[PDB]
Amino acid sequence: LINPGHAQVLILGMGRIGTGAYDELRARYGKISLGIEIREEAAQQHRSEGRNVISGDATDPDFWERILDTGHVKLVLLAMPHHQGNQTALEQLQRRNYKGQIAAIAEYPDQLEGLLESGVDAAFNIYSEAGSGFARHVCKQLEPQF
Amino acid sequence: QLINPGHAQVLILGMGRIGTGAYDELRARYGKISLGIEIREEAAQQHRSEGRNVISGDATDPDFWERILDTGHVKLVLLAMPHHQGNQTALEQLQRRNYKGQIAAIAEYPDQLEGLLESGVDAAFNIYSEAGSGFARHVCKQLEPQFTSI
């Protein structure tokens, strides 16, 4: 947040998924991410916890035109796997002439397929990612002597 | 119908998508050290056709556990069942056979994770937090975005 407004990563949805992604990116790159969260209470709690998060609706074209389309964004993470959130936000992003990368995480197989078909650069399954992270974090915390 | 886990050092209870990602992630780092237990016979067969050591069985059933040989190098159990109470029941079964190694669990909500810790697991992680972490990790590795680090 050295230069406010200059986030290079947008994380759309700051539930547990978005937050996990936010924390990982911070660890690697420092403070280059902005998370977007529709629930105001949730956004305020993230800000209290020291994360760069604002409230707003990633399906609203005006929020895109007024706020999110800054010209600095290199990567957008779609972390709204329920209620067609990912696909709806993707639609808005594509209307804007966005030249960066897009990645999505989805709950089911056919959902990943539709996201890739609609032009996301990379798509992942929530649970397969969770299993991979789980195994790493366990080996980190417990250091089993294999 | 005794079950000899052989050289397995990790028992993975539940081989749905979570257990499978864990199995594969461990295989990548440590080689063939895991044994998956899966209630769905057709899923267990599909895992075996893919080269994974997976046997069918219900890890909530005391009769399943009675089949398992006390001789074993198992140092880590991953609780990756699809139903939260299943992980809790599996943990109880492991405790009443006096298992000494470590146990890790994954769940949906902080109360579930705290409850697993209270019940005796060594580490407890949230399914969706872990998903977001691995999501970001894999996106960076696949896509190699060019950021200015701050």
Ligand SMILES: Nc1ncnc2c1ncn2[C@@H]1O[C@H](COP(=O)(O)O)[C@@H](O)[C@H]1O
């Ligand atoms: N349109 C949206 N804009 C920003 N955040 C959202 C939007 N829809 C859902 N979220 C948040 O994304 C997270 C996961 O949402 P869900 O897709 O319901 O699991 C939750 O914190 C939601 O409040």
